Every structure is written in C-alpha cells, then in structure tokens.
From Swiss-Prot, chain C:
Disease: Paroxysmal non-kinesigenic dyskinesia 3 with or without generalized epilepsy: An autosomal dominant neurologic disorder characterized by absence seizures, generalized tonic-clonic seizures, paroxysmal nonkinesigenic dyskinesia and involuntary dystonic or choreiform movements. Onset is usually in childhood. Patients may have seizures only, dyskinesia only, or both. Epilepsy, idiopathic generalized 16: An autosomal dominant form of idiopathic generalized epilepsy, a disorder characterized by recurring generalized seizures in the absence of detectable brain lesions and/or metabolic abnormalities. Generalized seizures arise diffusely and simultaneously from both hemispheres of the brain. Seizure types include juvenile myoclonic seizures, absence seizures, and generalized tonic-clonic seizures. EIG16 is characterized by onset of seizures soon after birth or in the first years of life.
Residues of the full protein shown: 84 to 417 of 1236
Species classification: Eukaryota, Metazoa, Chordata, Craniata, Vertebrata
Protein name, entry field: Calcium-activated potassium channel subunit alpha-1
Subunit structure: Homotetramer; which constitutes the calcium-activated potassium channel. Interacts with RAB11B. Interacts with beta subunits KCNMB1, KCNMB2, KCNMB3 and KCNMB4. Interacts with gamma subunits LRRC26, LRRC38, LRRC52 and LRRC55. Beta and gamma subunits are accessory, and modulate its activity.
Note: The protein was initially thought to contain two functionally distinct parts: The core channel (from the N-terminus to the S9 segment) that mediates the channel activity, and the cytoplasmic tail (from the S9 segment to the C-terminus) that mediates the calcium sensing. The situation is however more complex, since the core channel also contains binding sites for Ca(2+) and Mg(2+).
Domains as described in the record: The S0 segment is essential for the modulation by the accessory beta subunits KCNMB1, KCNMB2, KCNMB3 and KCNMB4. The S4 segment, which is characterized by a series of positively charged amino acids at every third position, is part of the voltage-sensor.
Annotated source species: Homo sapiens
Outcome of mutating residue 155 to Q: Induces reduction in the coupling between calcium and channel opening
UniProtKB/Swiss-Prot annotation, chain E:
UniProt family annotation: Belongs to the KCNMB (TC 8.A.14.1) family. KCNMB4 subfamily.
Transmembrane parts of this sequence: 15-35, 163-183
Tissue: Predominantly expressed in brain. In brain, it is expressed in the cerebellum, cerebral cortex, medulla, spinal cord, occipital pole, frontal lobe, temporal lobe, putamen, amygdala, caudate nucleus, corpus callosum, hippocampus, substantia nigra and thalamus. Weakly or not expressed in other tissues.
Keyword Membrane applies: yes
Further facts: Treatment with okadaic acid reduces its effect on KCNMA1.
Subunit composition and interactions: Interacts with KCNMA1 tetramer. There are probably 4 molecules of KCMNB4 per KCNMA1 tetramer. Interacts with FMR1 (via N-terminus).
Membrane topology note: Multi-pass membrane protein
Protein name: Calcium-activated potassium channel subunit beta-4
Gene from which this protein is expressed: KCNMB4
Location in the cell: Membrane
Amino acid sequence: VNLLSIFISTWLTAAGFIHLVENSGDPWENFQNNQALTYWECVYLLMVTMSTVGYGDVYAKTTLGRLFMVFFILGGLAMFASYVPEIIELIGNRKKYGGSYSAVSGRKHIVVCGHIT
Amino acid sequence: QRMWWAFLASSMVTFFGGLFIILLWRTLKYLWTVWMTSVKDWAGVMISAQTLTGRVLVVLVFALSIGALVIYFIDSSNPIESCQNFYKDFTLQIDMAFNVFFLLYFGLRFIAANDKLWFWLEVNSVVDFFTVPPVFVSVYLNRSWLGLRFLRALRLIQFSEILQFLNILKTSNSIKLVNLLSIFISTWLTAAGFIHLVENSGDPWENFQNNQALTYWECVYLLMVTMSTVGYGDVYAKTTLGRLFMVFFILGGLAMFASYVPEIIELIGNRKKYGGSYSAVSGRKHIVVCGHITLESVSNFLKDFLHKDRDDVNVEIVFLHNISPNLELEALFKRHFTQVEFYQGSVLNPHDLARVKIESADACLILANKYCADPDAEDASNIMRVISIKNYHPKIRIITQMLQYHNKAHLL
Amino acid sequence: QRMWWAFLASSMVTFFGGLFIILLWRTLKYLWTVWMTSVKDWAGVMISAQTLTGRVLVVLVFALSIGALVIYFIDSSNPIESCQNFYKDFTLQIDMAFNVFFLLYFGLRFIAANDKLWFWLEVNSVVDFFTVPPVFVSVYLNRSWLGLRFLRALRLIQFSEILQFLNILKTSNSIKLVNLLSIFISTWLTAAGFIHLVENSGDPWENFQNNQALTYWECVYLLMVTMSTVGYGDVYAKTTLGRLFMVFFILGGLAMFASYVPEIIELIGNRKKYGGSYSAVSGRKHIVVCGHIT
Amino acid sequence: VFALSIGALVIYFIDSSNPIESCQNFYKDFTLQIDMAFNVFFLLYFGLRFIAANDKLWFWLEVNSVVDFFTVPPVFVSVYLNRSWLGLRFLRALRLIQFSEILQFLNILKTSNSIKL
Amino acid sequence: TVTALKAGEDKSIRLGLFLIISGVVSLFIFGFCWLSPALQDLQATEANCTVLSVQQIGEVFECTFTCGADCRGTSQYPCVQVYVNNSESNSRALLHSDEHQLLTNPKCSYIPPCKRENQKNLESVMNWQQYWKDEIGSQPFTCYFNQHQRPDDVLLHRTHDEIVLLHCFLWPLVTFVVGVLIVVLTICAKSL
Ligand SMILES: CC(C)CCC[C@@H](C)[C@H]1CC[C@H]2[C@@H]3CC=C4C[C@@H](O)CC[C@]4(C)[C@H]3CC[C@]12C
Ligand SMILES: [K+]
C-alpha cells in the first residue's frame, strides 16, 4: 500500500507538471506551439511512457516538454532500479499457505501433526 | 435499433437474483416457530474429476467453449450491421446449441452445488451467467448481437487439468508451463475482447462519433505489442474509455509479470540438464562408467581408454551419476563433444538403469573415491552397486575398484 | 509469368519422397518368404570432424554457404522484375556452382547416412532440400526467382565448432559466446528473410494489391527494432500474414530470451576478474608476494 | 586536461548547433584564438605524453592517447583555412572517463561504492 | 552389434504430430480470414441486367500512373456514368467495371487505365464508350448484381476468384493428411 501510494503520487505529480508545461507554448515561439491536450491525455501519456509501451499517438511537442520528459524517463528508471530489487521483490514472494481448512461441508476432519516428510 | 441494452440487462438481471436470494435463504435460525439428498448425489456422482463420466463431460465443456470462441471470432470479424437472414453464421440453431448445453450445465452445477453461495461466487461460475443470457435474448430477437461472449475464453484455465487426466503430458514442469500458457492466453484474449467491445461504439461524451473501426484482430495485436512493451503506436486506443482500460491492462499485466516470473516462471526456466537414453549411435559397443564420477578419475580413465593408440576400437562411454556434473562440464566436459554422453540418473534406480540400457552394455565399470573418510563404507556402497547391476542383468561383465582387500570376499 | 509456384513445388516434392520412402523401407521383418559397407565407409571416412579431410570440407560448406548469402543479398536488393540477360549477377554459372556442390554434399550426406531416417530428420539436413531444388528450376527456366535461399544462413550454427578445430579461440566462455552470437544472427536473418518474402507479394485476400515495397535491409532493421522492443513504428508489416508472422516472431524471440538468458547468457556475463601477466611496466624491479594474502 | 576537455565540448556544442554554413567573419565563436587555445595545450600535452612515454609503442596504443591525434589536427587545418569545420571534436568527451580518479585525489568523495557509481 | 536400439525414432512421429498441428491451425486461420471475401462473393447473385442509358456527365477525375521507376505523376480522365436496368428487379442501378474501380471512384461506371497523355486517355474513353453504345437495351448478358448492401451498384466483373481460395485451402488439408500418414506409418514400423 505504501508503494502503490508513492507510485500514484509521483505519476500524478509528473503528469501535472507535463500538463502545466504544455498548457502554454514554449517561450521561444512566443507560446504559439501549444498543445491543446487535457490532464487526462497527459497522465495517460506518462503511463504509456513509464511502462515503455510508447505508442507515439500523443507525445510532448514543446522543447520544455521534451526536457522534462527525458528527466521523467530517467527518474522513473532510477526509481525502478532502486525499488524493485529491494522492496518489490520481497513483496512479490509471500506465504504459500495460511488460513483454515474451511469450505468442506459435512465431513469428518483429522490433522496429521508432528513430522511431515 | 436501440434494444441492445436488454441483452446485457438480461445477464445482470440473472446475476442480481443470484446474489440476493442464495444469501437471504441462510438467515433466521428459527424457520418459523411463531429427496434433496438423492438429487444432489445424482448430480454430484458425475461431477467427480476422478470418475470417467466427469472427466469426459469436462472435456466437453472445454470443447464447446472453444467452439463458442470460434464462432465468436467469425461474427466479431463482420461489419457493425449486415443483412442477417439467408446466412446468419449457420442460423439460430448453432447460436442456441452451445448454451442449451451450458444452461443445462449451469443448472447441473447449481443442483450439484454443495455450499450454495460459494458455488455462485466461484470465478468459474460467474462467467456462465455473463455469457449465456445475452444469446437467449438474441434468439428471442432473431438478430445477432456482439455481446461479452469472448469471456467464454476463460474456460481455457482448465486446459492443464485435462492434459493431466487424458495423460498426454506427465512432467510437473510441463503441466506448470501448460497452465501458465493457458492463463496467459485467456487473459490476453479477455483483455483484447474488452478493448474491442469498448472501441466498437464511441465514447458516450461525443455521442459515439469518435469510434475506431478496427477488428478484434487489430485489437488483440495491439495488446500483444503493448504488453511486450514494443508499442509501435501504429494502432492505439483513441477513446477515453479505451485509454482508461489500457492503463488498467498495462498495470494488470505488469502486476502479473511481477507476481509470476520470480515464483513459477523462473522455476520453469531452469530444468534438468540431462535425461533420456544414450541412443542414436549405430553398430557400436557400449559400456557405462558406474560409481564415483569425479574430475580426476575420468580425466585419467578417458586419456587411456581413448588415447588413439588402440587403432581398431570404438568410443562407447555412456557415464552415470547421481549428484550431476556441475563442475565437470566446465572443468573438462567429456573430452569430446559429439560423442560420450552423461546420464543424471542413479545406479540403484531400476528405471535409470533401464535408461542407460545396461542390458546392451558390454560392461559396467565401477570407480571408487580413494579419498573417502570410511573405506569400508565406500566399498560396501560399490558392492551394493554391483549387486543392483547383477540383479537387473545377471549376464554382464563388471569391473570394480575396491579400497580394501578384505572386502573382495563379499563379491564372491 | 505465373510459373513461380513450380520452384517451391520442386522443393516440397523432394521432401515428400524423402519422408515417405525412407520410412516405408523399414517395415515387414520377412523380406519376402511367401558393397554397401564399402561405399558407406568411403563416404564416412571423410565425414569425421576429427579427421583433416572432414574439418576442411566443413570449412568449405560454411564458406560456400556465406557465398550463397552474399549473392542472395545482391539479388534480393533488386526490383521485383529486371531485364535479366546481359548481366544477371554473373550468370547461371554462379547460380549453379554452389548448389552443384551442395547437391553432391546432400548425396554424400545421404550415402554417408548411418541411420537413414534420422539423417533426413536432422535439422541440418532439412534446410538442404529447401535451398537446393528452387535454383535447379531457376536454371531450367534461365530466369532468376527470389526463393527461400536465405534459409542457407542457418549453416552459421556451425561457426563455433570451426573456431574450435581451427584453434583460433580456446576459452569455453568464448566458444559459448561465439555460439550464441552465431545462433542469434542466424535466427534474426531467417526471420527477416521470412518477413521480406511475406511482404514481397501482397496478402491473398486483396488480390496482392496491399504489397509493401521494402528491401531486405528495411526488413532486417524492422526486426532488430522490434526484438530489442524499441519499436519506432516508422516501418511495420502492413499485411495480415506479415502481422501473424510478426506476433509469432515476437513470441519466439521472447521465448528464446527467457530460455537462454538465465542459463547461458548469465554465465557468460560473469567471467574471470584477473588473468594475464603483470606486464607493460618498463625498467622496474619486480617481486611477488606469494602465499597467504589476507 | 579535464577542464580544458570540457571547455572544448562546450564550444563544440555551440558550433554544432549552428546551420551547415554561416558568414564566419565578424563573430566566429570568439575567433581563431579560442579555436587554437585548447589544442595548443593538448598538442604540447601530446608531445609531453610522447617524450614522457616509457614504452614507446604502448604509449601510442593506449586508448587515452588515440583520441588526441583524432581531435587535435582537424583544428590545425581549420586555422590554416581560417574557416571552422564541424569535425570529430566530440570524441574529446572521452576524457570524462578520468572523472572518478580526480574526485578521488581532490578528496571530494570517499566511499568505494560512490567512486564506482 | 545392435538390437531394437536400431529403430530410435524421435524425428518421425514428432514431425508427424507437428505436420497435423500445422495443417489444422493453418486451415483454421484461413477459415476466419476468408469468410469476408467469400461472403462478399456469395452476396452477389446472377441476373441479366441490361444497359438502360449511357450519358456523358463531363466530370474530370484524376488518376495516378506509374512508369515502374517509382513514377508519381497524375493524369486526368473524363467521367463516364452508365445506368443499367435489372432483369428480375426492373430497378435502375449504377454500372461499374469491378470492385477496385468502385472503391477508387463510384461516380464513373468505368475507369480506363491511367495514361500519361490526356488525349490518349480521352481516346480510350471514346473507344470504350463506342464499345458500350452498341449494346443498349436488348441482348441481356451474364450479370452480377447485389441486393443487400449495394442495391444501386452493378458489377461487370467478379470481386474474387474461387481458384486462389481453393488453391490456398487444399494445401493445409493435404498437409494434415501427410502428418497422419507419418504418424500411423511410424506406429506400423514400431511394431516390428
Ligand atoms: C500448413 C501450411 C503451413 C502449409 C503451407 C501452404 C502454402 C505453401 C500455400 C497455402 C496457400 C497457398 C497460396 C494460395 C494462393 C495462391 C494463388 C495461386 O494462383 C498461386 C499460388 C498461391 C500464391 C499459393 C502459394 C502456396 C500457399 C501459400
Ligand atoms: K515503442
């Protein structure tokens, strides 16, 4: 739950940054190269990118957008490298057995205790 | 025509009644205050997976499920409207035929149910009242509608189990691999059907005008290109619903990859290095070096046995060991690549001894570790090996290293 | 001209006879009821990998195989039709020359065969009656046809073994790396040739009108960009057959990556940390601390 | 040598960003003086490395030496022509291989893991 | 010397199983992939449609011609619209040469092949137009007409040929048979 929460927070922060950077154009072309896209097309683009799918149906047109996009690729890669071997791998492997023998109506029941081999 | 809402409604309606009534029945201990066993047994005698009648009906539900997907792939490949009259995919008869059985089998599963509510909440049950009712409305309308019938592909989860009772495949690793392939195909085809269905009609917000005219085949392709992370962007979901589902399917596939590769896929990837017989070498003689295989012993044996000063001789050497050639394979291999094989089976196991075809050998040679802690123990192990070899085949020459002289008497 | 069906037919026809007759011969214990050894030995004395005559003919089959790929890359790079008369890629002579040897070597492999059926079902044998007959129809027609000749690149599987008998490379890790590189190049070039061949003529369903006019080089590039998962989508298969093969080649490459990286590639990645002499230090004195380093 | 190498890359990034032809006369990236200045030192330092060489041939075949006679002479022809040409001067970025070692003698970073990173 | 060890097998029943599996999957793929062109072919029935009138609309449409050396030139041709009458349906419909011509341009009932000279294209139109004015009204001939999707369209030529549909379908069927014989003939050899 901690990892999911931090992943959602960084995804939504970086999507908001790209939206804000694309709402007004680059300074250099007097804000004429502006992309008229929603926050939803923006947060989608970043999922398609950080998962490395990269359809190129939408991409940042602005030079500021690109500069941030290369930074967000590198930050996501760094987080993936610094989180998967440490915490995500441990979370992936869990208990194989737990809980009761339940959901078997009417029958008798015995437990083989002791040395199972 | 707008009546397509009634098809999905008829599914949801049957689900609704199912979740309300089956739980309402198990309330209030006092019934009121102020034949069932026979039919249940008759339904459940056939449902047993070990019984012949149950294994063969389970092949049936699976075969009919694939047949329902084949015809789904036929109609899903058509335009959104066609003149359905003289040739509507072999008519209402094949439309009803599979679900006339699945409705009977859903009824059979419900009267066969042994824990009422749990039977309904089994994931294997949930899909049935999703796929069955929409077609029962299609036949009442006498007009085909592309429904959620692709969810029937989720019966492919059972393919590993039928391969186990039909006894086609036997290795546990093979059964796990077939299980994994089957679940991967089922989820890929389910998620591809969802995206196809979501893109067939446009988003609600633009009054369905932003609809992408793509086939189920372009759709299932897109999802392979995406889940493999290739992502060519030659095709992608245009709709906002399509995108929302696409981000979910990326996250579900990533979750499955993270939760499956380290656990099962890694184990399947590493298998036995050696197995099967020494076979496919015509005419030659054959011997097995039994006993203690270690690097020095085989290096000095092979260098004399195959020194190229014998002239009129063959190669032979089959080899057999129980703790594998972990280091032997890098430290020396078998001083030949095409010839001289290695069996990972033990000398004592009759099945492994049959694997080497010991009966067809000219001799077994038993090597001993001179470096043993207890010479008596090593000698008695080699005598045990001699005894097993002689028991399997009395008529074979055996040659054997003994570490102590007094132990030679036990061979006599 | 429509006779291009006969080229692939001539391959399949020779395969057909091969699988039927070689198995039919080993049936019925009673032959009827109610020189072979000498020629086999003469054929197999040369086929030995340890013998000098066998190692040098195996270099030959490999060198001629690469030569057949070089000329394949030449013609596969041309338009779909050209005036083939005054200069048809050094004429019917070089067209026959390599397969005049490979047909003799296929005959040699069959008379050298020691377990009849198994010799035919060796993957190293299967490719020969695919690449050889189509050219024998090309010379009868005196008109070149782009066939399945790229499958000859599958002889590159042997490159590790010849590097071992020619004694150029000696480390086992080096031999495994050269083996892996060779098999990766062979499968990449085979799958690129399949996609090129599938895209040269259009899909059947649109009467071959949806054909993509791309070279073998754009095709082998596309497959590298795809199997590395980069996937620029500047080029992609347009045909439905091309897509069906492309999804299969994605799945085969993924399967090979899953079945090779944890087993062999990981072992090759980790090697010795130290080796060789203390050399390249002029003039100085030298001492070795022997014994217990801690 | 490291600071001058970065300076040669900074000016490389300046001119490489121009059109393929420009009127190079009144303001050619601070003139032939800065064009010669870095390689007047690197040519002296290549000469110094050759007279400092202790195993003649090996000094020449060190990868650190090979890059010098690739980056130095093209500029010596540029000054003879008095006209800038985009050459292989980006290979000078290969001096960045030494950055770990200078961080070790200047004593800024001390952990072995940090030096490897 | 050797025993039944001489049989071996491995690369025979295995190949036979791969051959039957390749055969069944290939025809199964072609089945899902040929229904559409087969549907379109069956959707058009046989009638004796008659030419009702040819008029010259006078429109000009652009066509693309190629010289083989990746020529991208475009030329112009006059538009010819011909209206036919069905035999059993007596309904006025638009003539077209073929499916290709229809989908590239449905306004003109013929597209002559694209010519580098506009004068030659016009002459071919007048030539084809003369070869179509002679047979008007009478002499009904074999005609293809659709009355499901395109009731106002009439084709002179068929969209598809059964020959390629059959030629690609026979191969996986015989490939399955070749797999089955290799399986059972291996089992026949395995006995003795
Ligand atoms: C089981 C499978 C893999 C067997 C292989 C079948 C192959 C060889 C068959 C199946 C369909 C066939 C094609 C179908 C249609 C045509 C058009 C015809 O006018 C000439 C041959 C041609 C171009 C065929 C060539 C061979 C072909 C591709
Ligand atoms: K991509």
